[PDB]
Amino acid sequence: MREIVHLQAGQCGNQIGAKFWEVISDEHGIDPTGTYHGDSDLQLERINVYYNEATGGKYVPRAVLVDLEPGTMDSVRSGPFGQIFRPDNFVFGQSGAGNNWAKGHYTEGAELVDSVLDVVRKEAESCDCLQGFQLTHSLGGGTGSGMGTLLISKIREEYPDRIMNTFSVVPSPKVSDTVVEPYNATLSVHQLVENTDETYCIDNEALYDICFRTLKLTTPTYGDLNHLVSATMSGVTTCLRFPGQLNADLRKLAVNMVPFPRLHFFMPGFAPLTSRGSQQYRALTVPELTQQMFDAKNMMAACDPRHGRYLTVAAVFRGRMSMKEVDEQMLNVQNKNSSYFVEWIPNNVKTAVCDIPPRGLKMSATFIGNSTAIQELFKRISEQFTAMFRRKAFLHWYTGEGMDEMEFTEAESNMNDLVSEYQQYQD
Amino acid sequence: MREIVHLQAGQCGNQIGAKFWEVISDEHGIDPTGTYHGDSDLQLERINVYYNEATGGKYVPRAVLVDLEPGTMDSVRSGPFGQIFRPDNFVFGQSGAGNNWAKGHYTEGAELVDSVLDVVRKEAESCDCLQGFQLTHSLGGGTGSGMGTLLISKIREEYPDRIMNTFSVVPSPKVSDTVVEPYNATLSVHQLVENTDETYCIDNEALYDICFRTLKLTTPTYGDLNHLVSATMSGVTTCLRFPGQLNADLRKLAVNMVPFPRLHFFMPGFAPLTSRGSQQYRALTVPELTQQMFDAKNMMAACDPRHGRYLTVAAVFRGRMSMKEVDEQMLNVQNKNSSYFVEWIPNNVKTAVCDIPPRGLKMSATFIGNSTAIQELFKRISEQFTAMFRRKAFLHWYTGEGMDEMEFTEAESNMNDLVSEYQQYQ
């Protein structure tokens, strides 16, 4: 009735979304085969936001998996919940991109874009009132960022009123594993700013800084980095599936976050994460949850909001919890610390309370924050673009795909507007 | 409602930070594993002064244990009472200062104040209405004296109205363990007075004047010295945690004790100290508490008021006594020693009474009081800093860590005036 069509692209996008569906299916009591085996009644009431219905009482997700190489479809099909996906939703080309934005955008990713848009137009018109889409990708590869922005351009030229949302994993600066990634990421941010409603920023550097510092894990892997992205991929959409004392969908947080239509890059974070020895030493009350949304170490971007000004702030609270204690603690963070808040917006906080917590938990909390300390995420990409671009470094890999050097020069200055557009609100 | 964060620094800051937290956990009835096995129900009322509360009935202390090397601090995690502190609170550097006040004040200790001020702001804004922090450290090493003076300088500026107490372990003149310990300690007492409100002095030579001369033990240990040190650390905050007839919080124990904010140097003493074969031959009576205090054998700083004047003197009584005996013994020891008090303050003795005795006891007392007989403590530390600096004895350890010779030069010029501040009442 308020359906969400999932899109997900690349090896990064197909390995984030495979764990996210293991989070949702347990949250709604769905087995590895698909059948419903829950206990409550609220688990089967708004399941149609994310799940279709097959025959025999078996639920199949609305997920369309996209890739340019054929080797990340076998990883997902034969994983833990790989048998819940309809096999027509998998899209794969028989030759990759190989860390290249141009092969993603023009050469290889344009013969594959017209077969996914025959899939998504079959899943988007099969919704009673489609709320919007989603994306999950990375700005470092070829098919995550090249064709992953070709798709968004075709969506927002075809369904403009609907919500387009992105969970971007923008490239990590100082744990980096590709020389040719700043060409991919700089060329991809003009396509984000004109064709997305919201966009979240995730760095894999700052997902490691949780798993070493906060959780005190011995050997984390990418299975515990996808485990945290799905924690905040479900808290944004938890008031759409479970009732509350105060609701907020994906649109009401978008109405209340962006003041100007070019300023939609945010910073998620999830509160009740506890290390294994400190698990028994903590109790679950309300100020235990607002001390870890707003802690600057907790954030899922590797940029610090003490260097900038919070334009607006969100919060999503889950559990059965008191409306006075919710409300009095967000006034509390506004008043002790009032140089991290913009003047011209007097209240900077939106709050929402959902009743049904994550399974086995009593209370929970989620965050979405908009900053002028996120123009420090693009200037560390600009400094490593024009340091490399001014000597025409890896340029033969891109210009021989059918490009031009002026197409680079505009993506210098279209992203350099967002540096100086955001800059005038710190003044 | 009157929480006290406990702030430590050093090997001495942990070896006092261990035995003290044993004898609150016996005073307030806490097992070796954290939980409560008490008898009364006055043993849970004002226990939020020192303990937090986790789940399951677990009371974890509000203590920050800080060091610059983990060698002496593994011994704290695996002691008898080493499993009641949370493991986040242990702050430890990977390279110590080691008997150098300069290393701990600029090069290594300014790089370790980064995360303690995340930790202490966690343990201060968790308190509902904080009464105040408390220091206890050594002035010998560079962990306690080099960085610990820089802890106070930061937190006095951020939290100005609150309270900063200290137990300075200033090293003794004749017995010592460090050549360069005048440099470590003369240097710190100029940066002490601007940032501290109330100070004491615990000299370990004065503890050897007890366990040989009063407790009659042949073989003392530091564990038998931290018993005496922490017998007074509880005795100051006893009114806070237990009810009485006439209470005294640590705010009130200073406001009758500091006539000016450079007169804050007090010498503790403690009443029930009696040998095990001399235990049976004394009655726990009100004159027996006040006869051992004003005797010069007992005082916890090796400095005697026969030279000096009892400027102001305090007293904290524990036990369930009759307070007129408290009132008459104070006056009959005030009239007799008529040369031992100044006369510009006519009443000089301050009083409190607390019902609950110390554990396994009946009556006891504790003394707090400044004098001009503690400018002699700084006459014997700045006679040997000018017996050492005049020909530049260990100076290359100090100038090459980002210093100047003015910072030494201003430090004598406090000892010729802060001592001359004390001198005018003679």
Next chain:
Amino acid sequence: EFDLSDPLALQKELPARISDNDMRNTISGMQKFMGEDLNFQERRRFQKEQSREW
């Protein structure tokens, strides 16, 4: 709703993971993680035995 305003709810409570073998620690409850290693030391030891024999 007395349970919200109990005076002893913090005593009458359980931590989210009493031990490593507890039933209510699933994937969505984010207390239990896959890459914590309790088989680390035995696996390293048998690796060293395998190396020695090779």
Next chain:
Amino acid sequence: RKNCSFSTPVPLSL
């Protein structure tokens, strides 16, 4: 060892 039985296309299989 690599097992690419799921991912090979139906034109090109065994």
Next chain:
Amino acid sequence: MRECISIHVGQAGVQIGNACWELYCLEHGIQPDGQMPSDKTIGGGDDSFNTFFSETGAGKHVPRAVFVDLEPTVIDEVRTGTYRQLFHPEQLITGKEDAANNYARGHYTIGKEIIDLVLDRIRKLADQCTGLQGFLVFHSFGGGTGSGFTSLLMERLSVDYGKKSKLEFSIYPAPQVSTAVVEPYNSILTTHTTLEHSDCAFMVDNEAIYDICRRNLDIERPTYTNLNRLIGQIVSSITASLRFDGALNVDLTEFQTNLVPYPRIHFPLATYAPVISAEKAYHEQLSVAEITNACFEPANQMVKCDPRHGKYMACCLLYRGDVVPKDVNAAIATIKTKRTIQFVDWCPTGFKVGINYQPPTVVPGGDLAKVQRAVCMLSNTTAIAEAWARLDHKFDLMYAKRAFVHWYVGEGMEEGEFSEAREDMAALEKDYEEVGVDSV
């Protein structure tokens, strides 16, 4: 007779409606499934419920309410709850996509989409009443459908129904705490466009009701269930002179003629005095003059503005329980003699009294005490002129740089309506000034 058509709008309106209609079922005899326990008299015994409940042929009572929302997740626990059989299913109107804290989405785009469906349902409930006193409106200024579509409910009510009395309760936004960021654009634009269309408008805000549940009742951490219980005990005391036997009767028409002197000024403020806890009514005698003084107390007020900053334009006292008509007089004469209350110069009469015999009801598992006397109050004060000044403050703040204005311009609405509905309010700030001057 004496019927009242309740209209609840928003998630705030629905969750307040669930609180009130549980109170009304217990206050009369109605079970949660509609039926009474069998009437055990000859014919129809008691017909007191007709102001709120209708009756079918079979002995089932269906409320005269309409529950409105634009998100489906709020009414779907009314539809599958304990009271799922009490409500006729067509009275509960849901949308498919909500207004998302936009006035403009809720006024021009999504509100106009759904206006004519619910103005067909209020015809059917208004053609069942032999004598209709007037509607009730339950909304909150903050949300989209609580501000946008609610303001357009009142406008199309004025065309269709004329000068019929349209009361409204509201949740005015709080001064310190706040749910949302865009609430000043919502709250200004709806007080501008309901201004000539609404008859009366009572306001409370949630921060003040927080200050009573924590303090007067001994309930730490009040959820919205404990706030919504107190709102139902104000609506019940306004309407208990219509259902139960009274010594002095007051209708729903005697509030507009006795607290609204001037056309732009229709803003009275609610208060309810003996809200007390069951450990602290074992000690206190609750007389008639002991609870009169506690409606004038700035602590026990139900909005976060002090009446002492302003002048009492009128009053309206609602006495409910075991009272005497002489001790009502014996307390009002005392209150006028204090100089810490100050009536406006041109109001030498002041008051409006109401005395009702049925004591207030005990809800099983509720908050308050079983109290034998009570007082409700709706008073109109000049001390609300400090409340728009904290709303002109936070409108001109984000409007001088024109934040969030693109979320209303492209949503079916021109931009000159922003720079006139704050100029429209700018006269109301001086209009509250000149009634604050004495006639020299």
Next chain:
Amino acid sequence: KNFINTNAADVIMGVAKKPKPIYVDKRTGDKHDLETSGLFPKYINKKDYGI
């Protein structure tokens, strides 16, 4: 480029997107278009009506 001043000119010098009219029924929000259904009069407005 001045964004703050030009972001306000883009909203004031513009037209509001008028909606396609849609009505509901059933109390579960079944939405239909208005013109294509037989309710609102459209086909007597044609030019060759009655001739």
